[PDB]
Amino acid sequence: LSQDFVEALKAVVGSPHVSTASAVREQHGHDESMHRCQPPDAVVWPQNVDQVSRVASLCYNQGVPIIPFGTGTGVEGGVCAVQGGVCINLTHMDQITELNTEDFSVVVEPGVTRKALNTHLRDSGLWFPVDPGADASLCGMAATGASGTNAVRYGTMRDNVINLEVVLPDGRLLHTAGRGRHYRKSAAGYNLTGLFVGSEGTLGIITSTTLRLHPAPEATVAATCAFPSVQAAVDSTVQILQAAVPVARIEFLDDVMMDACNRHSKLNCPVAPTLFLEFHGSQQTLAEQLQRTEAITQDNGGSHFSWAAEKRNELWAARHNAWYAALALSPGSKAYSTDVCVPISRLPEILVETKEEIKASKLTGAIVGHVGDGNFACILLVDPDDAEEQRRVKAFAENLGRRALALGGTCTGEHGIGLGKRQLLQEEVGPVGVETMRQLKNTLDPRGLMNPGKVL
Ligand SMILES: Cc1cc2nc3c(=O)[nH]c(=O)nc-3n(C[C@H](O)[C@H](O)[C@H](O)COP(=O)(O)OP(=O)(O)OC[C@H]3O[C@@H](n4cnc5c(N)ncnc54)[C@H](O)[C@@H]3O)c2cc1C
Ligand SMILES: CCC[C@@H](O)C(=O)O
């Protein structure tokens, strides 16, 4: 990367906001996944959208790859600079704007995390529900199409992103639904907002997100329920969903994951396949939901509910940290996560089969999942230096992905494709789907410089 080019970057954002130092680049060459660190040639921190546009235009016209970087909590290598280039760290743009409580909407810049937003909304009666376990950039969550434990009731990022401000690869500024617009529904033209949700930085740089806010629940009850088997817990889940109980949260942990979470969070739950549940409503509605949900779990051997403000917070913090609890089982190890999502009636088959396959293999695995969506993660620890183990781990993850595809599902419910699931995506949507996706990529990024090597 030439000195003239570095000076041009510094001319846009300021000398303190450009770095070519080895250690700074290495810190931006990886995310939380096992994908090997591939450092960008430089890291740049733009301070406003005009600077994002000018950095993108500089890189694009000089043939330099661009890698958007939020909080680096992704798990599919999205920020790995596989072709070098300029990593654009967006988190100094950290303002909340256009809070419209009467309309249930807000605009956030990439440095705003869900914690920051919900703290800012404290005492407003509103909250933002999509809750990945990591303290992630909300614009990064839009870029990956994230979900969370609350999505079963309150929707994913795709359900709750109303508008996006996007710097296209060549620097042009796009407001996907129109500048300043926010509304409940539209048939005006083609829906561009949904194209950029889940684009993982390969179609442009999200510099603001307009988000749907939700009313805080009148009352909340959380509980845990222990089961004799994975089959019993997942059968309960399917039956709760088929009975249309509007549960706020329904999360599965297998016995391995529950033990790991116990050890990492000083919970003391019985070591068993377990559901973490939460219910929202009036006291009337809560009693009815609990009534109907306890009857279903009882039919499948579930324990009496172990009830959980402070404990509920500790319960869900333990769940949100499941990934780190799993990594702590074998210290020094990294991990890969699967993320399949299947039609809910097929969820018992594939979780029970996954548990059986884990036991039949030399691999360690913990299972945790947004099972209310038909989604779960297998977290597979890896010794970073054991090449034989890593390719058993990819073989396992790749077979699980293909089993989900055979059941009519998808290879990723929320994490995305990144570097890890590119072949599975080709199998998932077939040749005409791949070509159509590539045609969209090509019209927005003709030179192929927008996070190359990812998704397609
Ligand atoms: C403990 C833990 C729990 C998690 N739980 C969940 C969960 O429940 N659900 C879930 O969906 N994910 C979960 N994740 C994964 C991760 O937090 C999400 O994928 C999150 O959306 C990533 O945001 P980020 O800014 O950290 O992404 P990064 O790693 O910075 O980037 C991810 C990808 O998006 C691109 N990108 C980032 N910001 C932008 C932007 N502004 N514009 C364009 N492209 C951009 C990057 O180029 C990259 O390809 C979890 C991760 C951890 C570590
Ligand atoms: C990063 C894999 C686990 C994550 O998806 C979660 O559900 O907490």
Side-chain angles (χ1 to χ4, degrees), residues 31-32 67-75 78-79 90 131-134 136-137 139-141 143-144 146-148 200-201 204-206 320 323-324 370 414-415 451:
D31 50 24
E32 292 298 287
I67 308 91
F69 191 108
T71 54
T73 69
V75 295
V79 300
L90 298 154
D131 62 319
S137 164
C139 291
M141 295 171 36
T144 62
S147 69
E200 299 186 39
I205 307 157
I206 296 169
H320 283 151
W323 168 260
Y324 294 114
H370 311 306
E414 59 173 5
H415 294 156
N451 207 358

Side-chain angles (χ1 to χ4, degrees), residues 349-362:
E349 292 161 64
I350 191 167
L351 290 173
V352 171
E353 184 179 5
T354 299
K355 185 67 168 174
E356 295 175 348
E357 283 291 336
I358 299 181
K359 294 224 308 212
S361 84
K362 297 185 290 293

Side-chain angles (χ1 to χ4, degrees), residues 436-453:
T436 301
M437 277 184 201
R438 187 50 191 271
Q439 285 174 324
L440 308 178
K441 163 67 168 177
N442 290 342
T443 69
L444 296 169
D445 177 25
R447 289 187 68 168
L449 298 167
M450 189 87 227
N451 207 358

Side-chain angles (χ1 to χ4, degrees), residues 21 24-26 28-30 38-43 67 79-81 84-87:
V24 178
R25 289 153 53 196
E26 283 185 335
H28 288 84
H30 67 87
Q38 294 186 75
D41 297 310
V43 187
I67 308 91
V79 300
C80 298
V86 170
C87 172

Side-chain angles (χ1 to χ4, degrees), residues 258-279:
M258 179 89 255
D259 171 71
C261 280
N262 280 342
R263 291 154 56 171
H264 190 75
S265 301
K266 298 178 177 68
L267 286 183
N268 279 284
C269 298
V271 173
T274 296
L275 295 179
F276 291 9
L277 302 149
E278 183 164 301
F279 307 84

